[PDB]
Amino acid sequence: MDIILGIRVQDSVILASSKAVTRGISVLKDSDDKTRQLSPHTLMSFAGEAGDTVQFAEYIQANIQLYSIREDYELSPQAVSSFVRQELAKSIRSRRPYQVNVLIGGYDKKKNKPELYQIDYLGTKVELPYGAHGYSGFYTFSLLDHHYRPDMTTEEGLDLLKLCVQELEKRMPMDFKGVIVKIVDKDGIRQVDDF
Amino acid sequence: MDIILGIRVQDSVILASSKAVTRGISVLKDSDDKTRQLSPHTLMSFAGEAGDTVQFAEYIQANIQLYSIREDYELSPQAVSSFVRQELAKSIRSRRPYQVNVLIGGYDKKKNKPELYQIDYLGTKVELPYGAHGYSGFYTFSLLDHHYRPDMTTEEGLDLLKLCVQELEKRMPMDFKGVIVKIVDKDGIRQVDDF
Amino acid sequence: TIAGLVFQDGVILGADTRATNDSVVADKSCEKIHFIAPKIYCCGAGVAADAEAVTQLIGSNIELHSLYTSREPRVVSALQMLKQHLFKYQGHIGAYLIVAGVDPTGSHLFSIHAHGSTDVGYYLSLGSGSLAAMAVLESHWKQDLTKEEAIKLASDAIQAGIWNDLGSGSNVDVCVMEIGKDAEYLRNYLTPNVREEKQKSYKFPRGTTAVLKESIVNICDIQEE
Amino acid sequence: TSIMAVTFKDGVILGADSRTTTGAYIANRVTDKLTRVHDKIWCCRSGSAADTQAIADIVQYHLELYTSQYGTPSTETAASVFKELCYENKDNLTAGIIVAGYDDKNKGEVYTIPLGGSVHKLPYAIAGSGSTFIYGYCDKNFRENMSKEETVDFIKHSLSQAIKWDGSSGGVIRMVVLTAAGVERLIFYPDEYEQL
Amino acid sequence: TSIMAVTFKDGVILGADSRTTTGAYIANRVTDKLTRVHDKIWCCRSGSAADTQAIADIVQYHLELYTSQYGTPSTETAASVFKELCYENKDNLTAGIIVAGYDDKNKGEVYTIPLGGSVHKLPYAIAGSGSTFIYGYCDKNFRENMSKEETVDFIKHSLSQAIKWDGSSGGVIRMVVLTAAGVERLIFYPDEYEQL
Amino acid sequence: QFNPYGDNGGTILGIAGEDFAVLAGDTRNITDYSINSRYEPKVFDCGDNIVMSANGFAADGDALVKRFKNSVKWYHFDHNDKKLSINSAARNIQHLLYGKRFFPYYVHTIIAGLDEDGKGAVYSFDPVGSYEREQCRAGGAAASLIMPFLDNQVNFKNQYEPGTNGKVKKPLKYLSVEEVIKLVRDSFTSATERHIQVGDGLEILIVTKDGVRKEFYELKRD
Amino acid sequence: SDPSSINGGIVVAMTGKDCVAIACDLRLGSQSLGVSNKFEKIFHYGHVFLGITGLATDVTTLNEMFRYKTNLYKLKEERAIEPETFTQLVSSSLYERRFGPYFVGPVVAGINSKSGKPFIAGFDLIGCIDEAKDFIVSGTASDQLFGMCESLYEPNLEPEDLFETISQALLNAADRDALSGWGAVVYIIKKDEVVKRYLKMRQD
Amino acid sequence: TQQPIVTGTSVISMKYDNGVIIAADNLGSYGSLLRFNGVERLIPVGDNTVVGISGDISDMQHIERLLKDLVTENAYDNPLADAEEALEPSYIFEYLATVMYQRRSKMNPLWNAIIVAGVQSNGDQFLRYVNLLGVTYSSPTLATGFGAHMANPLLRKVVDRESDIPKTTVQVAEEAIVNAMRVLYYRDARSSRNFSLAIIDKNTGLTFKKNLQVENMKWDFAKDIKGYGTQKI
Amino acid sequence: TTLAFRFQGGIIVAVDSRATAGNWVASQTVKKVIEINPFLLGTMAGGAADCQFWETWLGSQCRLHELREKERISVAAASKILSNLVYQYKGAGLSMGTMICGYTRKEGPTIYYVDSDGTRLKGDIFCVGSGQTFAYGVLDSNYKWDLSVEDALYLGKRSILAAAHRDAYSGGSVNLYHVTEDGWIYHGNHDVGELFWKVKEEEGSFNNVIG
Ligand SMILES: *C(=O)[C@H]1NC[C@@](C)(O)[C@](O)([C@H](CC2CCCCC2)NC(=O)[C@H](Cc2ccc(OC)cc2)NC(=O)[C@H](CCO)NC(=O)CN2CCOCC2)O[C@@H]1C
Ligand SMILES: *C(=O)[C@H]1NC[C@@](C)(O)[C@](O)([C@H](CC2CCCCC2)NC(=O)[C@H](Cc2ccc(OC)cc2)NC(=O)[C@H](CCO)NC(=O)CN2CCOCC2)O[C@@H]1C
Ligand SMILES: [Cl-]
Ligand SMILES: [Mg+2]
């Protein structure tokens, strides 16, 4: 719940998401995937309160999958982000809000462009070249201000994420047990299995 | 910070103390020694509130060191522990108590015997074969209750400590940046450099 | 600073033109004398949106009622509907109101509090400037005031507010409702606070501001062939 | 506030001061605290002004509809409607109402409805913040079957002591006389009652 | 508690009820609330029974040491002592004390010290929880230069009324008469004063 | 509970020219929505060519100005009538303020005069005695309205040379006293329009090598 | 905790001679953390411009809400909404949420397409309309904007003069606010022309 | 820290061409109970100063004593005590403003607001305010409690600035004060009819008028007000 | 936002110049480095008055030491007078985070972190303040032991610029110091207003920004 990153390079969006599920005093798991495939070319990472996070992501995943069957068409990232922001924007004035922050990384097959959207539990949407939820940003936004270019290759984007992961492991009080990393590109969603 | 361990074996005491110093959101140091030599054959490891820990450790150090010059003699570990206990027990009913927990590991050259003392900030003293302060105990005690034997060598003490650190690096939420390990035996105090 | 008083053959309302947000002036020329009916007006103090919304709501319903009954609307009707609606909301609509007008029954003056209490009176003041105003009204009000007298006393009560109360300021709005005559609304009746000419013009030499990019915005519907 | 009602030979008299306060500021110095719920049934109001106006209004509505169907309601029936409202909304009302009316059968009758929403039928009743100061006086000086002039004096003297000692009371003393003769409003200014 | 002192032709009388309460429990129904600080300087106590006893005990000490050194102190000097203590310790005290005494020079005097520690010289004085209920009665029935019989009666009627209405008051009416003649202690029982 | 603090409103403004300084304040004193005085001076001559205002809780501001004036009287006594320089004054006030670090003076303090090179100087202090020398400072209720204007007009902030694309800043200059007073008056007219605690009067104390001169201008009274 | 100051942001609107100007900053943050340096607060329906400061989720929601209502309006009325009418719609729409408000500071700017009369307004979070002749201010540096406007402003400025004034109001007020700046946008609006300019300001 | 118990309401005052006028009602309130109907809250010091006190009566009675003890102390080894070394209004104010501000700083204030009215050696008018916080201010008109809110508006209509003081006679000024006291009696639920007034004039000296009464009270319009809205009877 | 790190060529110190009152920017021209002597520097973060006063007072105590002992004070001894001082005030609400950075012969180039809750740490790299995390990110990712003096200055500068941008409560200008065998050397005030644009253009960084 305490580290989700994304970075949009030339031709892909890379989402990096810690493996640690901690409750109080004990690390319960060190291999947790804080992600759901929304459609073939759209991946949503999430971080926030316990239960709320997966319950929200699995609700959003159902809805986009229902849309994909009904129209026999895949929504643009811009469309899925807008759908999501509105569900959170509706949720914040509820009896019990979803306390969930999300990155949405998508490859728009129409515009042949990678897109990254940071949305917090209030319904605050922003399209970004790089994004982070929670304490991570405090370190990673300065790093990426220094080392990011908009024409970087996917390998260059992965090298840039190692620095973000090194710097968080160096300076952040909690042991988050590393990151699972996923690349969204014109060919869909794949996991880098060594990181 | 946080984790201080002690293991009393056949002919030595081993203190293990975390190297992290964390303030809020940043790890400020990753090579911190949480220990003062009180006398040539007596070591105190300490953890608790920032400021209090070092001020109380160096306070105890100067007082024992004074006694050593005045009598040209080295107070027993038992004498050092009872002096420390009474300083904390006096402190707990002050205007502003010392929020410090300590382990004292000494080799008593008169009885040719290693001794481990666990004292909390209330001035609660106990002689133990193994001890821990804060959340560490909740893991390491059951581990030692299983693996510990009183007639173990120092090399077996160290292996038994590696088991305690591996477990703490698996199941504790906060990265404590490794441990500094020190052996107190008949020959005095030395630091195990590679751990 | 809002006030109203009765005179020989009518009733008059006065109000300042200042709106505050904490300690800053949000507005120097706001109209606190709200229209309900042609010859029924309502001075507003308290939460600004609440005073504006509750006078518009009752004013809308009084119009539908006037149409329905084919009659000139009465002041006691505006009074009852404001008071029942404020009462329902238990103070949460933070509106303090002085209601006055002419109807077929004669001339009327009433105060309304946020919790739904009403008062009857020959002279009334409300809001942060009400004690400044009530001191002037309690010094100078008598029976059978002429209109020239009435307008002098009402405007003096609002000035007490403007000068002596930090909550009140700028200009005096007045509204006169005489029997068998058209109500006359006298916005900026007094203008005693015109900003003095500035020492300097701060108009900048053109190009002073650094600009990154320019672009034309398309505001028309359909650029067409 | 200082309010009372007193039964005498010919009917009943309602009395009240005219002071309404918002803390120490006198919001209205000529308040009419004597309110008509029917031709010959009036009440004295004390507590939240908003609350007691809303209540007296509903009660006037109920007694007007009563009269349409069943004719002139008894004073008791007016008390009963006040009680019903006060008792069932006790968690959101600060109302302390004295009900007083004239029938030709029952003659003059006074009921008091304190903050409980309980009902009490009494020869006389005092209520409001100013009433505490005149329990002693009123208990000593009240008699049954007083004349009209005696009952005007008893109330004028009583409310006068209440006004002197209570900062929340003051102004003119309003009364309403309720007999077979009809409905007589009275007013007494400070320069009369202060020097009693 | 219901306590009063009144100046009349021959000096002053102190009267009090006898009821001490812990909440609604009457801890003592025969309390003597009339306390000697000198031959002809008494007080009536109201508030914390601890606090007023501590104070009256300290004043009795100060006036004994005064008499040793400078002869008989004036009722004014007793009031000042009561005031000095009450004013200076106003944050740790709950004392409402009435001071009454007889000189041949000044005759009957009454001083009242309410909570804050202010002093007020008055023809008469009433205090305690029961006093609220007789402000009206006392004001209408007090005259200056009454006879002993008139002042006993004025006090007996007044406390009779405070007792009727106040639950914190009751029991017997204790009176202490301070004249040239000396010191006379009067008690009045319920079966006399209730039927007034 | 007893609240030992209150707010008398008012607003102050120091501007440092080449061979002079000004310290200005409105003369209005308020509590809540009441005006106490329309003319209660707030900017004092303390001697040694030092003018001083302690704006906020007027009681604490009086206490402080009264203690600094005395500080000056004793520095003459104890150091053979030596002139207390503004930098030395600035440090002295820090100690005065910081003496009450755990029960502060509820004031924002500006002093103005000449440094030991005869050049105009403004010093500026938070309630517990942090201080910096500046060209410019507004204190009190309408500081937030005035300081951006002074940033723009005195220090030529965000202003560039026309036709330089946006790469040559407007070069810094010392303003004349005539020019500074116009800025002061325009700042207090502006503040008075929009802040209900600023108005009635504007008093300006001007400090040159020759001494301390005063100017007084009416402000709107609503 | 205070919704009006989590994200930051400022909007300022001025009238000139046959023109209006509306301008905004580009900052969006989570208190001390800056997040986006491209978050625009000025939206337009037809020729009516709306700037919105406050809670960013409400800034986005209300834009989506006023695009919706102004689209239907146009489909029924068969004409673009006018600034006077849109202002009332905003007030209505804020006051309907009286006891659960949007945490925003709206500002309407535009020219009546019939009368040719320049028009600006501002609103409290519950719909009270302030219809200024001179200028409107909104956001975390509102005090700073009031001070800058009340001094810098003068009536009947030409389009290219009002651009210089409004830019200098925003830029200097943003620089005295921690939660405003990071870039800014200015709209110069004429009856049948609209220029948009990105200002080079300090990036702290 | 305490809370005031017995309290005195508005003290109002103003400068006129030659002297100063100060007035205060004769009531000691015990919360809402109008307890004491004979309390004097204008205390003269010598023949050139009147100190008008509002707030807690016990804290007022203490300040009374401080001032009486000050006269005594000023006489000590002072052959000129009834001439050039007599107490000035400015000396008395500055003493009180010192005490008031020291009591607030010890978190034990005197629960009062104080107007010092008087005329100095040289004939200059003196009017200055001090309260429980030690806040001080001077104005041609000064008032405490309700009087700030109601009296000041009325008195400022006569003296709106400094240059108005020489145009105001003692008859105009007194009439303004006596009118303001009547207003305050209509509209302050913790005021009384019986008041005291002191003029301190640089020629005629200190006039101290006791047992004044508000009169010309207008109640008549009351007889016509019926109910709270729709009631006609 | 303050940092100080050790490298081959000695110590680099860099601070921002902003002061705040909540969201009110109080100044953009504040000094946050006190020059205690030619060989000893203090950095300031937290309570403006707490830092200015007690570090001025530390200078006094460093001067008395060299009068009484005819010897420049050790960085250890100086850091421990401030740390022992604030430890006496602990609980009273002081707010200070500070780095004592200086050179002596016996110690070589040394940095001690000291904060108002009484922590005293020696180390090679510290960043202190609201902006510390932003500074750490840039500094830790470009830091080696053997930077040129020129490069180390730039990094320390660039690390403060990084924090000036992202942290709402940092900015104004970057003040730069370099500590050697020979003592501290000022390396200038750099206004963020001009420095941000030069760095963007020359480095091709800050691609988050409309340039
Ligand atoms: C005379 O006595 C005048 N005194 C001035 C004043 C301002 O108190 C006021 O009552 C005036 C009433 C008029 C203003 C013009 C339109 C008609 C109503 N009221 C305000 O200006 C009002 C102040 C106020 C704020 C809050 C509360 O309750 C908490 C009471 C009064 N201002 C506003 O409401 C501003 C207007 C923004 O432009 N907005 C807010 O206060 C926003 N908050 C409102 C409360 O809920 C939270 C949001 O005029 C009298 C007659
Ligand atoms: C880098 O991370 C910078 N972050 C910015 C900042 C502002 O937080 C700060 O710490 C800066 C430190 C320098 C030190 C050298 C002198 C200039 C300031 N701090 C402040 O500017 C400070 C913020 C602050 C306020 C309050 C507290 O504790 C309550 C801690 C920090 N400002 C002030 O203290 C203002 C200055 C106004 O001119 N004044 C007040 O806050 C007044 N109150 C102080 C507390 O007691 C009540 C009165 O710089 C770092 C390095
Ligand atoms: Cl009523
Ligand atoms: Mg009364």
Ligand SMILES: [Mg+2]
């Ligand atoms: Mg103003």
Ligand SMILES: [Mg+2]
């Ligand atoms: Mg900014």
Ligand SMILES: [Mg+2]
């Ligand atoms: Mg910044």
